[PDB]
Amino acid sequence: GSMVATVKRTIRIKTQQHILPEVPPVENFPVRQWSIEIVLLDDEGKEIPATIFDKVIYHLHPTFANPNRTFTDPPFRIEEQGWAGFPLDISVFLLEKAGERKIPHDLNFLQESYEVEHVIQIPLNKPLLTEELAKSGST
Length: 139
Prior knowledge:
The protein is mostly beta strands and 139 residues long. The protein has one domain: Sandwich (Immunoglobulin-like). It has one helix spanning 127-133; strands at 6-19, 32-41, 47-48, 53-59, 68-71, 78-82, 87-94, 99-106, 113-123. Residues 61-63, 83-85 are annotated as: Acylated histone binding. Keywords: Isopeptide bond, Nucleus, Transcription, Transcription regulation, Ubl conjugation.
């Protein structure tokens, strides 16, 4: 049906984290600085700016102050501190009001950095978004 008028793109969520020794551990758990960024992959697998989104909102655990953090410029980098990793939710908003996509993300501390790929389906009915989509592959 309607879903036939879409293309697929792969986005890559890039996470990094390291301990902050100057912050007192919480219940013996060290507090870590962590960061998340979002890039788009082209049809060859290279990273390019995710300009298909005009906004990203990280939906953090309610332990955080202002847990819903909005970013408007690629690579939508968020940095926070915490002692427990958690699923957060990442809302990405396609250009021209083409749609929200919600992406759970496991924030975890086993690896200093790790990347996770997600495929999203994107409509082809907003001219500015379609023109932007041309940069990352066929349309």
